[PDB]
Amino acid sequence: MTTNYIFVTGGVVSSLGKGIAAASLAAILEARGLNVTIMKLDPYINVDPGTMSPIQHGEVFVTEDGAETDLDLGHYERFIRTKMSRRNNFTTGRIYSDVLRKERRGDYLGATVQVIPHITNAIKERVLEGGEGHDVVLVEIGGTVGDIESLPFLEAIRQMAVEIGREHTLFMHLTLVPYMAASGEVKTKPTQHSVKELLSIGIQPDILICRSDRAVPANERAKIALFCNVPEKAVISLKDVDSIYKIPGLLKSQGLDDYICKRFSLNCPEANLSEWEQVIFEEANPVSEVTIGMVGKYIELPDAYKSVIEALKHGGLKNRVSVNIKLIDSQDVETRGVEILKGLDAILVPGGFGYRGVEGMITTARFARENNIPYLGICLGMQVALIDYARHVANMENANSTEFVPDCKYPVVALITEWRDENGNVEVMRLGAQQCQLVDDSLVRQLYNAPTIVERHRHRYEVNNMLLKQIEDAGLRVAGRSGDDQLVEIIEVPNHPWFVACQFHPEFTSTPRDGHPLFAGFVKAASEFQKRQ
Amino acid sequence: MTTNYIFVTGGVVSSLGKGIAAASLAAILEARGLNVTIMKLDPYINVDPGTMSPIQHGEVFVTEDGAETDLDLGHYERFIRTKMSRRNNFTTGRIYSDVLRKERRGDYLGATVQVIPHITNAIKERVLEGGEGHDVVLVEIGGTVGDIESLPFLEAIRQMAVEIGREHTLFMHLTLVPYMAASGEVKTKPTQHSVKELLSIGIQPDILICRSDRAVPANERAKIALFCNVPEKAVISLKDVDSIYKIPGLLKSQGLDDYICKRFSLNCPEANLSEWEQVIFEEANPVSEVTIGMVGKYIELPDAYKSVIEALKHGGLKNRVSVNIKLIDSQDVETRGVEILKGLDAILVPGGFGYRGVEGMITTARFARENNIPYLGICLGMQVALIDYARHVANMENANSTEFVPDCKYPVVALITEWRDENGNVEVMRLGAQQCQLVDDSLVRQLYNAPTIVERHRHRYEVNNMLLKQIEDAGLRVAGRSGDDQLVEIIEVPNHPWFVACQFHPEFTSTPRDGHPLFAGFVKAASEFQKRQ
Amino acid sequence: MTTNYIFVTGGVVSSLGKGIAAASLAAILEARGLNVTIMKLDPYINVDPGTMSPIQHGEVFVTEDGAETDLDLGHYERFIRTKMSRRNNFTTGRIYSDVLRKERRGDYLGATVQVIPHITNAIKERVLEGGEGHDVVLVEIGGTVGDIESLPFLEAIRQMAVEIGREHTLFMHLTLVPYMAASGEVKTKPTQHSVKELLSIGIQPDILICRSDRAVPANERAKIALFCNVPEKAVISLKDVDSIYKIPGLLKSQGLDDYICKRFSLNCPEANLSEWEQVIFEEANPVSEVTIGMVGKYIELPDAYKSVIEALKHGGLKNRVSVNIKLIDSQDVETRGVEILKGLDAILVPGGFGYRGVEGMITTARFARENNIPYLGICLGMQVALIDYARHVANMENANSTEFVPDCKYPVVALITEWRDENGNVEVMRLGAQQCQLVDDSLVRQLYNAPTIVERHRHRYEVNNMLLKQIEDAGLRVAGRSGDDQLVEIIEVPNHPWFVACQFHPEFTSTPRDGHPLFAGFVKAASEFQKRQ
Numbered sequence A, B, C: 001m002t003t004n005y006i007f008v009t010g011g012v013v014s015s016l017g018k019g020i021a022a023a024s025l026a027a028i029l030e031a032r033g034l035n036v037t038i039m040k041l042d043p044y045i046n047v048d049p050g051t052m053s054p055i056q057h058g059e060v061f062v063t064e065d066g067a068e069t070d071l072d073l074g075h076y077e078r079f080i081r082t083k084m085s086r087r088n089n090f091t092t093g094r095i096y097s098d099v100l101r102k103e104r105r106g107d108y109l110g111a112t113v114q115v116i117p118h119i120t121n122a123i124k125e126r127v128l129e130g131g132e133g134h135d136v137v138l139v140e141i142g143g144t145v146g147d148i149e150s151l152p153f154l155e156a157i158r159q160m161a162v163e164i165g166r167e168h169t170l171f172m173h174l175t176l177v178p179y180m181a182a183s184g185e186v187k188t189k190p191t192q193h194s195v196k197e198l199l200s201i202g203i204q205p206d207i208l209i210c211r212s213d214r215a216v217p218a219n220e221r222a223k224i225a226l227f228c229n230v231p232e233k234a235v236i237s238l239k240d241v242d243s244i245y246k247i248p249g250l251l252k253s254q255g256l257d258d259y260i261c262k263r264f265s266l267n268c269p270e271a272n273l274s275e276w277e278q279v280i281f282e283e284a285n286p287v288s289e290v291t292i293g294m295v296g297k298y299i300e301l302p303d304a305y306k307s308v309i310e311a312l313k314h315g316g317l318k319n320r321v322s323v324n325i326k327l328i329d330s331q332d333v334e335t336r337g338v339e340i341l342k343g344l345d346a347i348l349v350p351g352g353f354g355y356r357g358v359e360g361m362i363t364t365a366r367f368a369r370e371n372n373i374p375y376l377g378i379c380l381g382m383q384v385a386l387i388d389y390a391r392h393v394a395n396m397e398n399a400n401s402t403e404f405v406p407d408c409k410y411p412v413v414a415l416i417t418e419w420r421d422e423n424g425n426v427e428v429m430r431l432g433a434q435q436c437q438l439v440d441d442s443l444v445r446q447l448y449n450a451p452t453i454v455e456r457h458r459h460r461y462e463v464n465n466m467l468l469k470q471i472e473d474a475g476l477r478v479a480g481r482s483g484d485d486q487l488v489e490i491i492e493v494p495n496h497p498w499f500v501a502c503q504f505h506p507e508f509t510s511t512p513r514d515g516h517p518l519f520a521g522f523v524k525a526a527s528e529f530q531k532r533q
Ligand SMILES: Nc1ccn([C@@H]2O[C@H](COP(=O)(O)OP(=O)(O)OP(=O)(O)O)[C@@H](O)[C@H]2F)c(=O)n1
Pocket: A186, A187, A188, A189, A190, A223, C114, C115, C116, C117
C-alpha cells in the first residue's frame, strides 16, 4: 500500500502549535489502526540541537537511538506509540552539511550544486527515508510561510506532491484567525494573505487549521473555505484549550480524520479515543493537591524542562493528584538560602551542565534529605545528591565533579578516564536507550516491578567507582547499574520516605496514557508528605 | 577616507554580462586614479569551482595566491591592475561551510543559528574583508533577482547599505530591455517587474544598466527613470558590442563614472581611456590574418578555455594579426586522423585532466613537431609534447603519464612520489604564482627578456626527472625549472621554428593592454608560417 | 453542449500577439467543425474606443451590430466566420459604468459595492453572456500579468475556472523566451518569473505559448514543462513569422488543438487548413508587383488603417499580385503638390474626420481622375471624390462639406438636417451593417454580382441630395443607395479605367480566404495600369 504524506505548515505567526496539532491528528489516525509517524523539518543552521542552549531553544529531546532532537519529538512520542529516531528530525544545517560532504567528496561528478535541484533533492530524500513504510507520514515544516528560511523545505514538499500526486499527499496549513474587540469578530484577512504567500510558492492548501483564543464560527470558516477553494469540512476550528489531551477529540468531532481517510482512500474503523477520554477524566477529577519544587539553572525558560514538567503532570494523573510545579532558581538558594524551599511537598533537581547554580542544587539535595522531603534527582540531580551525601555524611570535604572543580581531592563525579581516589591513585557523552540492572530490595526494583529497565542518557560525567565504596559504607545505596564498567545509574537514601536519583532521563519515556513508575512513585510520596503535615 | 560599495545585481535573465559591466566600470574609475577592486558572490553550493567541470561551469581561474575561482575574476584582472585573491570570490557553499564549522565548534555560544542574522552576518564579514582599504568596491551578486538562491546575498547587502548609508553605497541593477518586432520598440515591462522584485526585498536601485541588442533610446530611458524614481543620467544604455574593450568608453560617454564620483563625493580627474582606445585601434586595424587550431577535450563549451581564447586575441593585438581560433575536438584526431589539423598556421593544446582525448593530443603534438607548425602546449599540452618526443624520438615505447596508464614502463609524467625509471628503480596539486628560472639560449629566455618569471600553476603530475636525461639526450631542451626539486616548467624542440610547452597557465597573466610574451611570440610565429606557405 | 473557455493571458511584455494567437487557434478549432468565438477584455478606462484617437490606439473596428470595438475584433473576423458583436469586447470603463449605473439607481439594495465580489461578478456576467451557446470561447485578457490594471479580470476568470471546473476551462499563457547572443540560447527565466506572478493570483497555466525571434528548442520547452508542471505537449514554440496566415498550421503541427480537444473531451475530425495553405501559397507566389498609394491624415500610425492595409493584401492574394502599400501624408500633397503622387499604380483615400489634410485628399482625387490612375475612396475618400467632381467638372466653386466649411455655398456633403441648395433653400453617426441597393450597369453591381449588398458604416456626413442631380448631369454616376432617404452609398466616374468611392467601410468585410469584390477589382485595375506603363 502507498505511503501518504500530510505536509503541516504554519502562517501569520510561529507559535501556532504545529507540533501538538500534527501529534493530536496522528493520535486519531493511530486509534483507527493506521501505521502513522511524524517528522520535524527545522530551518535553523545548527546541524542538531546538541549545541543549542536550553534557555534559548528549550530542552534537547533524546530518542532511543541517541539522536539529539527538537522538543517536538517529545510531543510526538507522548501522542503516538511509533518510536522516533534520527530520521524524524533534521535541520537546514544537516541538509547543507550532507550536500557539502558529497560535493567536496565528488559525488556530483563536477556538476554545479544548486538550491534547486540539489538542496531540494537532499530534503526529499530525508523525508522519504523517514516516511516510507508507514500508512500516513505527517511532515511538520518549521517557521512561518513567507520567510526565506523555509523556502527550500516548501519547494521540496511542493515537488513531492507533484511526483506522488493529490491521491497520497495533503497540505494542512495552520493559520491565526485573531479576535478584534473593535469588530467583535475573528479576522480571516491574515489567513487570506498567508494563503496568497503559499500560492506564490506553488502550494495550494487542502486543509485550513484555524487557531484563535475562541471558536472560529461556521460563517468565518465558510469565508475561508471559499477564498481557499476547499470544502467547508476541510476548514477546522482549533481554539486555545486548557488541556492538549482534548485536541484529538476536538479535531475528530469536526471530522478531520474522516476527510484525511477519504482523500487517501483509507478504509479503517472509527477512531476510539477512550484512552484520551480517560486521561481528560483523570486530569479533571483530582482527589488531592501537592506543590513540587523544581530547582534548576534554566527556569527562565520553562520549556528547558518540557518533558520533566509533563512527566510530573503524568505522575499526577496516575495518583489523582493536582501537581502545582514551582520553578525555583538554584542560584536563589545560594544567595537567599533554604528559606525559598519552604512549603514544598517534594523537590526535583533536573539535568544540566556547568557549575553555575550547582552549589544551590547541592544545598537543595541536603535540605530534602535532612528534612525527609521526597526527592527525585535527574542526571545533575543525581550528581548533587551524591556530592551532598559524600560531603555531609561520608565526611569527604569539598567533594565535587571534575566538570566543576577539576583538581578537587574527592572527585566523586568524573569522566571514566579521570577516575582517581583521594591519594591520586588510578585503576589498571552517553546518548539514547541503555539497559539498567535494578538491585534487589531497592525502591526502584519495586516501582519498575522488573529486574532490568531501558532508559535514555544524555551525560558524560559518571559516579567515580574508586570513591563509591566509602559513600556506600556511609549509608548511601546503589539501586541501579549498567554496562561492563558497572556504572552507577540509580542511588537511594534508605532512612528517608522517598529519595531516588538517576543518571538517565526518565522524563523522555513518560506519557500521559502509560505514565512512568518513578514519577508516579514521586508524586504519591509528595501526596503522603502533604497529608502528614 | 571611507570605502564605497557598488552592489551589482541582474534582473530578467542571468547572461547580462554583470562581470564585464562591473569590470568595465572599474577600469574607468582606476583610470581616474581611484583604488578600485571587484568581488563575485556565487549562489551555487560548491565550496569553490575546484570540483566543477569545465564543460559545465567554464574555466577554473587561478589567482596569484592559488585560489580556484569563477572565470569572472579573469574579466576583473583583464580590466583592472588590482590583483585578485581568495577574498574576491566566495560561494553560498563557503558561507554555510564556515557557519557550520563555527557552530559545531561552539562559537555561537548555544544560540539558534539562523539565515538572519548568522548567514547574512557571514556574507557581510566576507564583503568587508575583500572591500575595506579600497576607494570603490564593486560587489557582483550572481543569479537573477527574484530567485531564492541569491536572497541571503541580497538581504546581506541591503543591511550593509543601511549601516554604511547612501553616501558610500550604490545599487547598480542590470536589466534586459528586449526589442519586439511586433511593437518595433524595446520593452521596459521586464525592468518594471524586476525592480518590483528588488523593492519587495528592500532594495531601491540607484543606477539602471539597460542591456539590449541595440541602443535603448532616451524616451525608454526616461520611462525607466520615472518608474524607478532615479535621475535620467542614472539610466544607462549598454547595447550588445563586437568588442568588450569599447564598454569603458560607452559607459564614460553617458557619464556613469561622473554620477558615481558625485554620489560618493570623490574629487578625481576625468578618466583617460587612451590605453583602451589603443586596444580598440589595434583590434580594428590588423595587417594580416592567421588560423590557430586549439585541440582539447572541453571544446563543447568554449568558456572552458576562456583565458586561453582571450590570450590568443591579446597575441593578435601586439602583432596586428587577426586570429581565427578553430576549436578542434582531440577525440576527432583519434577517429578521423591528422586530416582535421590541415590548414592551421599554429596549434595550441590547452590544459585538462583524465585520459579521454589525450592520445589525440599526443598525435596533434607529433603532427605540429614533424610538419614544423608553431606549437604552444599548456600543462596537459606540455605532457603530450614530452610523451610525443619520448615515444617517437627518444624511442621510449608507450611512454605515458601515471594519471592515464599507472603501470606504464616509461612514466615520463608522474607524481613526485611515483617517480621511477624503466627498471622500477626510485630516488633516495600545485596552485598559484611561483618563480620559474629560464635557461640561457632558450626561446623563452629571449621572449620574457628576464632570467626569472612568475606564472600560475593548476596541476599535480610533474615531468619525471628520472627519465628526463634520456629525452634530453634525444634532443628535447629544458627551458624553465622551479623549486628545490628542479621541476621542469618549460620544454622546447630546437629544430623547429616555434615549439614551446609550459607546465604553468600563462593565459592567466595575459591582458589586452600588456599582452603576454609567450602568446605574442606564438601568434608572430603563426603569421610567419602563414606567409611562408 | 457544455461551453468550454480558453483564458488567454500574456507575460513578460505586452506585444506577444495574444489576439493573433487566440484567433489562429480559433481558426484551427473552427476547421474541426466546432462552434467557436473570441472576446477581448481591455483594461483601459475608456467606455469604448469611440473616443480613442486613430494615431494613438489605431483603427476603430465596426461590428455588424454597429459596436465601436478594439481592432483585435478585426483579427478575429479575419480568422473565423463567427460574427463579432458588442458582446465580444468590453473595457474596465464599461464594467465600472455598468456597476455605477446599478449602484446609483439602487440595484445593490444598500450593500457596500466592492472590487470583490461586485466588479468581478460584472466581468463574469459579460464573459458568460458573450460565451454561452458556443463549443469553445477564447477570452483574451489585455495587459501583462503582474500589472495592477488586469487584476480584477484575472480574479474574475480564476473564479469562473473554479465554478466551471478544469474539464471545461484552460489557461493559455503567452510568454517571451528571449535569445541572448552572450549565451547563444533562448532564456526561460522570464517565463519562470511570469508564471510565479500567475500562481500568486491563483492561476495555474495549462498551456505555455513560447514567443521568441526563433524556434524554442525541445530542451527549453522541457525545462518550462517541468517548472510549470504541465505536459511537454502543452508547451508550444511560436517563433516570429513573416505571415500570420502560417500560425494556424504552426500551432496544429505541434498538436495544440489535439491537446485542447482532449482536455474538453471534444470528438471532432482533423483540422482541414486547406484554405489557409492556399492563402500562404498565394502570398508566397505573386506573379507581378504594384505600388498603391494610401493618401490619408493618420499615416504616423499604420494601425490607424489596419483593416484597409489587410484588405489591400487580400486584394493581392486573389490577383496573385504583390501590393507595395506607400503611406502618403495628404498634408504633404498640400505643401509639395501632386509631385509626391508619381510612380503609383493606384490611389486609395481612406476614412477620416476633421478638415486637416482634406484639401490634399481632394487634390489627390483630382490627380487620380484626370491621369486615369485607379482610385478607391472610403467614406472621407468618397466625400473628396464628390467635392473634386463638384468643383472641377460641375463648376461648383469652393464645393465642400459642412463638417469643414459650414457656411460654404455648395455643401455637396452635409448632415441630413443641414441639407440646402446653392440659394439656401431646404426640403419640405450611422454605425454597423446596412443593406445597399446597387444600380444596374454599374461597375460595383458587376463586381459584387448581386442587386443588394451589406456593408458597415461609421460616418455622420451624407451626400447632399439637393445638389446631387447637378453633379450627376456633369457626368458622375450614383452606383449604390440605402434607406428611405435614398442616401448615396457608392459613386463611379465612367470615363476612367477604375474609379469607385463608397460611404461604407468595405475593409471590415474583407478576409484573406474570401477576399473582397471592391479590393480584388481595385488591385486588378492597379496591375492592368502597371502593365500599360
Ligand atoms: N485579494 C483581495 C481580496 C479582497 N479584497 C477586498 O477586501 C474587502 C473586504 O475586506 P475586509 O477586511 O473588510 O473583510 P474580510 O475580507 O472578510 O476580512 P476579515 O474581516 O475576515 O478579516 C472587499 O471590499 C474586497 F474587495 C481585496 O481587495 N483584495
